[PDB]
UniProtKB/Swiss-Prot annotation, chain A:
Expressed in the testis. The gene is NUP205. Part of the nuclear pore complex (NPC). Forms a complex with NUP35, NUP93, NUP155 and lamin B. Does not interact with TPR. Interacts with TMEM209 and MYC. Plays a role in the nuclear pore complex (NPC) assembly and/or maintenance. May anchor NUP62 and other nucleoporins, but not NUP153 and TPR, to the NPC. In association with TMEM209, may be involved in nuclear transport of various nuclear proteins in addition to MYC. It comes from Homo sapiens. Belongs to the NUP186/NUP192/NUP205 family. It is linked to Nephrotic syndrome 13: A form of nephrotic syndrome, a renal disease clinically characterized by severe proteinuria, resulting in complications such as hypoalbuminemia, hyperlipidemia and edema. Kidney biopsies show non-specific histologic changes such as focal segmental glomerulosclerosis and diffuse mesangial proliferation. Some affected individuals have an inherited steroid-resistant form and progress to end-stage renal failure. The lineage of its organism: Eukaryota, Metazoa, Chordata, Craniata, Vertebrata. It is found in: Nucleus membrane; Nucleus, Nuclear pore complex. This is Nuclear pore complex protein Nup205.
Curated annotation (Swiss-Prot), chain B:
Phosphorylated. Phosphorylation and dephosphorylation may be important for the function of NUP155 and may play a role in the reversible disassembly of the nuclear pore complex during mitosis. This is Nuclear pore complex protein Nup155. It is found in: Nucleus, Nuclear pore complex; Nucleus membrane. It comes from the Eukaryota. Belongs to the non-repetitive/WGA-negative nucleoporin family. It is linked to Atrial fibrillation, familial, 15: A familial form of atrial fibrillation, a common sustained cardiac rhythm disturbance. Atrial fibrillation is characterized by disorganized atrial electrical activity and ineffective atrial contraction promoting blood stasis in the atria and reduces ventricular filling. It can result in palpitations, syncope, thromboembolic stroke, and congestive heart failure. Expressed in all tissues tested, including heart, brain, placenta, lung, liver, skeletal muscle, kidney and pancreas. Essential component of nuclear pore complex. Could be essessential for embryogenesis. Nucleoporins may be involved both in binding and translocating proteins during nucleocytoplasmic transport. Interacts with GLE1. Able to form a heterotrimer with GLE1 and NUP42 in vitro. Forms a complex with NUP35, NUP93, NUP205 and lamin B.
Curated annotation (Swiss-Prot), chain C:
The chain holds residues 547 to 683 of 819 of the full protein. It is found in: Nucleus membrane; Nucleus, Nuclear pore complex; Nucleus envelope. This is Nuclear pore complex protein Nup93. It comes from Homo sapiens. Plays a role in the nuclear pore complex (NPC) assembly and/or maintenance. May anchor nucleoporins, but not NUP153 and TPR, to the NPC. During renal development, regulates podocyte migration and proliferation through SMAD4 signaling. Part of the nuclear pore complex (NPC). Component of the p62 complex, a complex composed of NUP62 and NUP54. Forms a complex with NUP35, NUP155, NUP205 and lamin B; the interaction with NUP35 is direct. Does not interact with TPR. Interacts with SMAD4 and IPO7; translocates SMAD4 to the nucleus through the NPC upon BMP7 stimulation resulting in activation of SMAD4 signaling. (Microbial infection) Interacts with SARS-CoV translation inhibitor nsp1; this interaction may disrupt nuclear pore function. Belongs to the nucleoporin interacting component (NIC) family. The gene is NUP93.
Length: 118, 127, 137
């Protein structure tokens, strides 16, 4: 389980919101770690998987598995808080500096994006 | 119907298969005058193991389906000879009857899919 | 598409022939229409020919190529399907055991009695095991 990874994910969000780090270089690292974490959590699965899980829950006929959905929910809560704060930081940042760090931050924004889509 | 059950057929087939593969793999050592006589004897045995494998394989096939109906309709004058056929008789084959029967298995619908292809292969190879 | 690619041979000579082959190979790959293009289900009785097979020949090498690629992507099912055509029986079961093995461990509420990896498991066993089984014990 990438539970241990979860803690790093939290630290990353913390640093970003704080926007400490004179270096965007630092923030690029934070963005990269977050990107992998978001991607890692949902191994490529598509709506079919979600539908199957819901049915199984169907209702807990017996013992269901709803592990991946639960993991996504926890990620999304953490992310929310930290989120408003950090969204501000991530976008402004965007522009400038780092045309570089950019490659990293835009990718982070897009992954995040699916999840927390909605 | 066959004297032996399907489970048993599979068991024998599986076991002989293991032996067949074993000998096939280490055939070089055994084959290739006392030495020559040993060579001949071992060659004969290995051929025998393979032959049994083939007979059992056909039976594995037959077990799948609609064997009984064809048997009843098919058997003619030759039938008495057929019924008193032992496994060893298949081991050391009575080729013509089986060929005719197998042809009927293929000609008729009984063989399904992959099986059918296999007999046609068989008739081609050893028939 | 296959019908059109086949015309390429109409210009008889090497080069064109390879171009044809490459085109078909390219078609199979990325279209991923394996059943249609390559073939399907044994029920003993080898492959049921795909459209290309009707045209024929290099088909085994393409399968290995596609199958390996499936492995990269991790498109299991496609790999199993491809290996069946490849007739790598041992490989099929092994991939198969892996697929069934996970999905077994997990949490409960599943397994309708009609279709999936389990069902897939049933298909292969019934299918291969009776017949001159080439797989490892």
């Amino acid at each position: 389980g990438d539970s241990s990874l979860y803690i790093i994910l939290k630290k990353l969000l913390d640093f970003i919101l704080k926007t400490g780090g004179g270096f965007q270089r630092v923030r690029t690292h934070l963005y990269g770690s977050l990107l992998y974490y978001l991607q890692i959590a949902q191994r490529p699965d598509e709506p079919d998987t979600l539908e199957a899980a819901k049915k199984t829950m169907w209702e807990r006929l017996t013992a269901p598995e709803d592990v991946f959905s639960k993991l996504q929910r926890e990620n999304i809560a953490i992310i929310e808080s930290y989120g408003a704060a950090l969204m501000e930081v991530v976008c402004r940042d965007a522009c400038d500096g780092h045309e570089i760090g950019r490659m990293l931050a835009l990718a982070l924004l897009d992954r995040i994006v699916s999840v927390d889509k909605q | 119907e066959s004297s032996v059950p399907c489970q048993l057929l599979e068991s024998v087939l599986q076991e002989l298969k293991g032996l067949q593969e074993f000998l096939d793999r280490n055939s070089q050592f055994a084959g290739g005058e006392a030495q020559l006589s040993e060579k001949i004897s071992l060659q004969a045995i290995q051929q025998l193991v393979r032959k049994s494998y083939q007979a059992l394989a056909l039976w594995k096939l037959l077990c799948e389906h609609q064997f009984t109906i064809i048997v009843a309709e098919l058997q003619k004058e030759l039938q008495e000879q057929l019924k008193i056929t032992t496994f060893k008789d298949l081991v050391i084959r009575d080729k013509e009857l089986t060929g005719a029967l197998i042809a009927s298995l293929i000609n008729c619908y009984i063989r399904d899919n992959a099986a059918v292809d296999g007999i046609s292969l068989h008739l081609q190879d050893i028939c | 598409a296959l019908q059109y690619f086949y015309f390429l041979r109409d210009e008889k000579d090497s080069q064109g022939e390879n171009m044809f082959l490459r085109c078909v190979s390219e078609l199979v790959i990325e279209s991923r229409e394996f059943d249609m293009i390559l073939g399907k289900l044994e029920n003993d009785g080898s492959r049921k020919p795909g459209v290309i097979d009707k045209f024929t020949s290099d088909t085994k090498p393409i399968i290995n190529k596609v199958a390996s690629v499936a492995e990269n992507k991790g498109l299991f099912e496609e790999a199993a399907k491809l290996y069946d055509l490849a007739k790598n029986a041992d490989k099929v079961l092994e991939l198969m055991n892996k697929l069934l093995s996970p999905v077994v461990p997990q949490i409960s509420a599943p397994q309708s009695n009609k279709e999936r990896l389990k069902n897939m498991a049933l298909s292969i066993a019934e299918r291969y095991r009776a017949q001159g089984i080439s797989a490892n014990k």
